[PDB]
Design an enzyme around this catalytic site. Structure first.
Site, mmCIF file in Angstrom:
data_model
loop_
_atom_site.group_PDB
_atom_site.id
_atom_site.type_symbol
_atom_site.label_atom_id
_atom_site.label_comp_id
_atom_site.label_asym_id
_atom_site.label_seq_id
_atom_site.Cartn_x
_atom_site.Cartn_y
_atom_site.Cartn_z
ATOM 1 N N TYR A 29 -10.788 23.538 42.540
ATOM 2 C CA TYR A 29 -12.051 22.899 41.924
ATOM 3 C C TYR A 29 -13.300 23.630 42.456
ATOM 4 O O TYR A 29 -14.100 23.703 41.482
ATOM 5 C CB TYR A 29 -12.055 21.308 42.242
ATOM 6 C CG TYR A 29 -11.189 20.522 41.426
ATOM 7 C CD1 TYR A 29 -10.786 20.692 39.891
ATOM 8 C CD2 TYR A 29 -10.239 19.518 41.817
ATOM 9 C CE1 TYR A 29 -10.144 20.194 39.218
ATOM 10 C CE2 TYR A 29 -9.529 18.843 41.067
ATOM 11 C CZ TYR A 29 -9.409 18.966 39.792
ATOM 12 O OH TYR A 29 -8.502 18.322 38.821
ATOM 13 N N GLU A 55 -35.105 21.456 20.731
ATOM 14 C CA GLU A 55 -34.714 22.481 20.165
ATOM 15 C C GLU A 55 -33.205 23.061 20.253
ATOM 16 O O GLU A 55 -32.813 24.008 19.597
ATOM 17 C CB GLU A 55 -35.566 23.922 21.065
ATOM 18 C CG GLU A 55 -35.841 24.870 19.942
ATOM 19 C CD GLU A 55 -36.462 26.036 20.687
ATOM 20 O OE1 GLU A 55 -37.399 26.115 21.469
ATOM 21 O OE2 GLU A 55 -35.905 27.327 20.520
HETATM 22 N N1 LIG Z 1 -13.611 21.329 36.520
HETATM 23 C C1 LIG Z 1 -13.264 20.525 37.111
HETATM 24 N N2 LIG Z 1 -12.533 19.563 36.644
HETATM 25 C C2 LIG Z 1 -12.228 18.409 37.371
HETATM 26 C C3 LIG Z 1 -12.940 18.233 38.808
HETATM 27 N N3 LIG Z 1 -12.561 17.076 39.229
HETATM 28 C C4 LIG Z 1 -11.712 16.537 38.111
HETATM 29 N N4 LIG Z 1 -11.443 17.629 37.160
HETATM 30 C C5 LIG Z 1 -10.795 17.099 36.038
HETATM 31 O O1 LIG Z 1 -11.184 16.115 35.246
HETATM 32 C C6 LIG Z 1 -9.922 15.346 34.831
HETATM 33 C C7 LIG Z 1 -9.859 14.190 35.724
HETATM 34 O O2 LIG Z 1 -11.068 13.193 35.663
HETATM 35 P P1 LIG Z 1 -11.843 12.780 36.709
HETATM 36 O O3 LIG Z 1 -13.457 13.144 36.733
HETATM 37 O O4 LIG Z 1 -11.104 13.526 38.296
HETATM 38 O O5 LIG Z 1 -11.687 11.128 36.839
HETATM 39 P P2 LIG Z 1 -12.760 10.153 36.994
HETATM 40 O O6 LIG Z 1 -13.995 10.300 36.011
HETATM 41 O O7 LIG Z 1 -13.178 10.018 38.384
HETATM 42 O O8 LIG Z 1 -12.117 8.644 36.340
HETATM 43 P P3 LIG Z 1 -11.055 7.925 37.292
HETATM 44 O O9 LIG Z 1 -10.020 7.765 36.224
HETATM 45 O O10 LIG Z 1 -11.582 6.617 37.748
HETATM 46 O O11 LIG Z 1 -10.676 8.571 38.553
HETATM 47 C C8 LIG Z 1 -8.975 16.172 35.119
HETATM 48 O O12 LIG Z 1 -8.560 16.861 34.107
HETATM 49 C C9 LIG Z 1 -9.136 17.001 36.222
HETATM 50 O O13 LIG Z 1 -8.640 18.352 36.042
HETATM 51 C C10 LIG Z 1 -13.629 19.405 39.286
HETATM 52 O O14 LIG Z 1 -14.339 19.135 40.074
HETATM 53 N N5 LIG Z 1 -13.998 20.323 38.465
#
Ligand SMILES: Nc1nc2c(ncn2[C@@H]2O[C@H](COP(=O)(O)OP(=O)(O)OP(=O)(O)O)[C@@H](O)[C@H]2O)c(=O)[nH]1
Ligand SMILES: Nc1nc2c(ncn2[C@@H]2O[C@H](COP(=O)(O)OP(=O)(O)OP(=O)(O)O)[C@@H](O)[C@H]2O)c(=O)[nH]1
Ligand SMILES: CCc1cc(/N=N\c2ccc(C)c(O)c2)cc(CC)c1OC
Ligand SMILES: [Ca+2]
Ligand SMILES: [Mg+2]
Ligand SMILES: [Mg+2]
EC number: 3.6.5.-
Lengths: 155, 426, 436
Positions: free
Chosen positions: C224, C254
């Protein structure tokens, strides 16, 4: 009526009370509402001595209840090995079929009583006997993945 | 999502429950007195999930011990970690249930259940954010089965928004040849379908077969069987107890593993299988999916995988893992339902268990588990058709119709599994 | 100057936000404690970087940023990390129980317990602004918080700030890095409920970022952190016009004018070049023509799709570094003589050009080589519909069997909202097919 009393004494394993009731003329082949006899009930609950005494005083070893269950069916189901052997020595029909198409071999197989399965086979149990759904004892073993049972059935 | 309240009921439940606490204690550095004695801070980051920290820097299992038979008590305390448990958390009656579900659920157990919930309340109020509950028990007996399901019912009533998780040991003639066990098990499965979110099916038939046929133990003991259970229990809880890329919890597991509420019975597996005193990533992967490695006596290749979770433990190439897991999915793509895309998830933990440097744990929601319920249903039906030993149950107040309802519900469960086994995307 | 507030929701939103504000501080000369020597106006000001940083009187420059999560683990690292002193402590907001990968929990049940605290903290920042332009919202599609709480937040922001623009940076799920099987559900649910409330949304396909890290940066198994540092460089290139002087995309309004011809089709495709491994610090320095041409190679796209199967409706090129305008015009002239670039018949076929003459910044610990000139192309192409189609199809496979739906119905949501969201996506796809 000493019939009901003998049926209850046989079920409860009260040996001395079974001897008394047969001395006072109790019907050794009395039936309860479902057609179960003292021998049925003693064979279900594992009372060997009562099984032997009943058989020595005129019990029908192959009596059937309303569902076609014989004492051997029930002893094979519950897993009373010595009672199975005693019933066979006194002429039990090793291939008796109940209303569900089940033989003693079917029931011992379903319940995993492997030693009883062997005894029934040694006494001519029919490996080709089908229940009402077409299953033989071997089919049951193959269907439930009981490799130990399937080995025994292929001896 | 932090604290898990552990409950162990009956002989089997307390037996495998005690071995569970011995194993995860070792993995986490907690000694039999409650003191930490480890060499890594990873052992402690998520320790609060299963342990209450008392004064003295002493860690105490959040564990409640239940049995209608006092005998099991002395056995636990005399055990290695027997003194680690909160003495107040032992709730034990005087007369066992005599392998009678009805005594456990309706008479003996009902008299003791209130005392048990008093202890569950206390533990629950001492939690920051309670995840839910984890129960160990058998289904073939009377206390773990009858009173265990009673306890599940009451707890679901008091904590309806918490996850209920069970490790349920299914009976087998190969281990205990007591013919009323299919009664007790069918009556309980009826309860688990309605009141648990996730159930690990630990099949004594499978445990015996593994010990007997695979490990060549001529006469397996409960210790042999429980050695495999403790390994499975440690593997499936690894991500709750060790901090990883994922903040795994019981609800996230349920949401992603259970596509339909009633189909929450998981088939666990583990590789390598070992005896109590005695491998590559591809070997680990194939063995994990092997029917020989399943803790339920069902062939996964006779059904279809709805969802799968894999856990690799040890030092190993995460990319090699990723490539083996993808391989097993494409070669055998027919065994994974196409209408649940990307239904196999992998996690890797650096800490391996005792005695092993690399291990893999498998958790499958497969339609093949219907083979287990069919085996029990056939034994239930063989006994019930002849009405054998029914007065033992009706003599405690149950109706004959309670048996037909349970059997009907279990056969419906089987049909539901078969329905999704044959379903297609088309 | 006109202030912009950035909001980061859920793990992905928070972690990408960390990367972005790390980059912002370096780009503007701000230390992890907020001190900035080059600022001569101590106590406040109207400089262009004041759009993103308030200023205390002790020289402290404070991000106009809020971080929200329903579980504290991720945000707890911000509170104890290098930038623990940078952000408003009260603008790091955590609950104790996350959404369990369930849009309905993030939106209806769990999310409702913290929504009003989040809004009151946002109003606090807005009240320090002399002319708030709007919000930048960072979140994942697949997470229960990123999807459900973001949708709830955007709904409340529309009512409480009807005149303000809302931009999204949304992380589109990829099975390589996916966490949950229900992410197609959450993605369609949040899209449907957020469409009317968002003015412009830059989707980041985790698979595209994953492939760039592997191919361009020679990272075998990207983490990540690797993904987020590359994403932050693209975000920074998109928001640079708001934080610096320039003539293109100078305020949030814009962005819509230049990239969004109609409200519902507001999903521009971002392409960034050059991405070069930091282990090759002595690379041939690419010319303007070379990096401009790379913006039309699908390998450099932030969403996997084929713009050759589609039509362009807008194209904005944002250059950074040693870029002479005449070389941009010559490079654009070439592009216009490529028949794979087809514009719609109702839009100005030309390209909009901005140039920030400061060379791009690379973070210490990053995987990107420093370069003398870089470009981010923002285009609105109907080919992005292919990414919606991929999601729609995974959604359809599971919903046909109603798999997992009981998890949503049990957390305060009606089953009909599934079909309502799917039909909305059906209409969005026909919107694209009609322009194409
Ligand atoms: N690019 C990127 N994607 C991430 C990262 N962390 C999680 N994801 C992606 O986000 C998705 C999972 O959502 P999360 O943001 O981790 O979950 P959340 O918003 O905390 O919601 P919860 O279900 O309560 O945990 C998956 O597709 C992961 O691959 C990150 O640090 N960078
Ligand atoms: N794997 C395993 N199974 C066990 C163990 N102990 C008992 N069982 C199984 O559990 C079932 C019997 O239930 P028990 O747990 O012994 O009975 P209970 O729950 O204590 O209730 P009561 O019968 O009234 O004492 C049988 O299927 C046994 O094979 C054990 O230590 N390990
Ligand atoms: C401790 C409980 C636990 C929870 C998990 N959370 N989410 C999962 C689970 C399965 C799948 C299919 C999914 O997509 C996510 C994941 C794992 C192992 C990968 C886990 O360990 C058994
Ligand atoms: Ca200033
Ligand atoms: Mg017991
Ligand atoms: Mg989260």
């Amino acid at each position: 009526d000493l019939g009901k009393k003998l049926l209850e004494a046989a079920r409860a394993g009260q040996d001395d009370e079974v001897r008394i009731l047969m001395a006072n003329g109790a019907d050794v082949n009395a039936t309860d509402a479902s057609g179960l006899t003292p021998l049925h009930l003693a064979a279900t609950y594992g009372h060997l001595e009562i099984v032997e005494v009943l058989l020595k005083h005129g019990a029908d070893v192959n009596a059937i209840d309303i569902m076609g269950s014989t004492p051997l069916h029930l002893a094979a189901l519950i897993g009373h090995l010595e009672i199975v052997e005693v019933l066979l020595k006194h002429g039990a029909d090793v291939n008796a079929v109940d209303t569900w198409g089940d033989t003693p071999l079917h029931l011992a197989a379903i319940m995993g009583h492997l030693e009883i399965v062997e005894v029934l086979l040694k006494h001519g149990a029919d490996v080709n006997a089908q229940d009402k759904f077409g299953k033989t004892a071997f089919d049951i073993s193959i269907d439930n993945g009981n490799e130990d049972l399937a080995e025994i059935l292929q001896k | 999502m932090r604290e898990i309240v552990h409950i162990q009921a009956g002989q089997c439940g307390n037996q495998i429950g005690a071995k569970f606490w011995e194993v995860i204690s070792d993995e986490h550095g907690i000694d039999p007195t409650g003191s930490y004695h480890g060499d890594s801070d990873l052992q402690l980051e998520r320790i609060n999930v299963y342990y209450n920290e008392a004064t003295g820097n002493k860690y105490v299992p959040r564990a409640i011990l239940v049995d209608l038979e006092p005998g099991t008590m002395d056995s636990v305390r005399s055990g290695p970690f027997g003194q680690i448990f909160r003495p107040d958390n032992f709730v034990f009656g005087q007369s066992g249930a005599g392998n009678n579900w009805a005594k456990g659920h309706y008479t003996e157990g009902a008299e003791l259940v209130d005392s048990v919930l008093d202890v569950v309340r206390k533990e629950s109020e001492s939690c920051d954010c309670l995840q839910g509950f984890q129960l160990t028990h058998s289904l073939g007996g009377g206390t773990g089965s009858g009173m265990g399901t009673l306890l599940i019912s009451k707890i679901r009533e008091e904590y309806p928004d918490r996850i209920m998780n069970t490790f349920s040991v299914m009976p087998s003639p190969k281990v205990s040849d007591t013919v009323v066990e299919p009664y007790n098990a069918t009556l309980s499965v009826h309860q688990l379908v309605e009141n648990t979110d996730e159930t690990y099916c630990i099949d004594n038939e499978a445990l015996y077969d593994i010990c007997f046929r695979t490990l060549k133990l001529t006469t397996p003991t409960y210790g042999d069987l429980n050695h495999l259970v403790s390994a499975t229990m440690s593997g499936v809880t690894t991500c709750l107890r060790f901090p990883g890329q994922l903040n795994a919890d019981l609800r996230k597991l349920a949401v992603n593993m259970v596509p339909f509420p009633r189909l929450h019975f998981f088939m666990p597996g583990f590789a390598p299988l070992t005896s109590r005193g005695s491998l590559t990533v591809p070997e680990l992967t194939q063995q994990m999916f092997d029917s020989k490695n399943m803790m339920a006596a069902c062939d996964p290749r006779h059904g279809r995988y709805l969802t799968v979770a894999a856990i690799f433990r040890g030092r190993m190439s995460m990319k090699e893992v990723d490539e083996q897991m993808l391989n097993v999915q494409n070669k055998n793509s027919s065994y994974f339902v196409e209408w649940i895309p990307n239904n196999v998830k992998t996690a890797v933990c650096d800490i391996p268990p005792r005695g092993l440097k690399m291990s893999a744990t498998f958790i499958g929601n497969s339609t093949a588990i219907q083979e287990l319920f069919k085996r029990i249903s056939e034994q239930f039906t063989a006994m019930f058709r002849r009405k054998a030993f029914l007065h033992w149950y009706t003599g405690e107040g149950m109706d004959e119709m309670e048996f037909t309802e349970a059997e009907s519900n279990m056969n419906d469960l089987v049909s539901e599994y078969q329905q999704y086994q044959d379903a297609t995307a088309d | 100057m006109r202030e912009c507030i950035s909001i980061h929701v859920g793990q992905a939103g928070v972690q990408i936000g960390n990367a972005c504000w790390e980059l912002y501080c370096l780009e503007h000369g701000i230390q992890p404690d907020g001190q900035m020597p080059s600022d001569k106006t101590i106590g406040g000001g109207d400089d262009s970087f004041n759009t993103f940083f308030s200023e205390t009187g002790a020289g402290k420059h404070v991000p106009r940023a809020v971080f929200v999560d329903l579980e504290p683990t991720v945000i707890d690292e911000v509170r104890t990390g290098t930038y623990r002193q940078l952000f408003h402590p009260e603008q790091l907001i955590t609950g104790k129980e996350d959404a369990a990968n369930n849009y309905a929990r993030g939106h209806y049940t769990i999310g409702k317990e913290i929504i009003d605290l989040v809004l009151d903290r946002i109003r606090k920042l807005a009240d320090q602004c002399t002319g708030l332009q709007g919000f930048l919202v960072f979140h994942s599609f697949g997470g229960g918080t990123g999807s459900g709480f973001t949708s709830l937040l955007m709904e409340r922001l529309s009512v409480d700030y009807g005149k303000k623009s809302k931009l999204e940076f949304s992380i589109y799920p990829a099975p390589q890095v996916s966490t949950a099987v229900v992410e197609p559900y959450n993605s369609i649910l949040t899209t449907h409920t957020t469409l009317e409330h968002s003015d412009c949304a830059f989707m980041v396909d985790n698979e595209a970022i994953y492939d760039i890290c592997r191919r361009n940066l020679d990272i075998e198994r990207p983490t990540y952190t690797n993904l987020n540092r590359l994403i932050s460089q693209i975000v920074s290139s998109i928001t640079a016009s708001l934080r610096f002087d320039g003539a293109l995309n100078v305020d949030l309004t814009e962005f819509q004018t230049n990239l969004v011809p109609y409200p519902r089709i507001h999903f521009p495709l971002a392409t960034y070049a050059p991405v070069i491994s930091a282990e090759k610090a002595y690379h041939e320095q690419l010319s303007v023509a070379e990096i401009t041409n790379a913006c039309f190679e699908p390998a450099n796209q932030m969403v996997k799709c084929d713009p050759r199967h589609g039509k362009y409706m807008a194209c904005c090129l944002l250059y950074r570094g040693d870029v002479v305008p005449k070389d941009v015009n010559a490079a654009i002239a070439t592009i216009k003589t490529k028949r794979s670039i087809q514009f719609v018949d109702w839009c100005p076929t030309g390209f909009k050009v901005g140039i920030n003459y400061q060379p791009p910044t690379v973070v210490p610990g990053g995987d990107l080589a420093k370069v003398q000139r870089a470009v981010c192309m923002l285009s609105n192409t109907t080919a992005i519909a292919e990414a919606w189609a991929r999601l729609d199809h995974k959604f359809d496979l599971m919903y046909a069997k109603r798999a997992f739906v009981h998890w949503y119905v049990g957390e305060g949501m009606e089953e009909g909202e599934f079909s309502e969201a799917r039909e909305d996506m059906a209409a969005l796809e026909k919107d694209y097919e009609e322009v194409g």
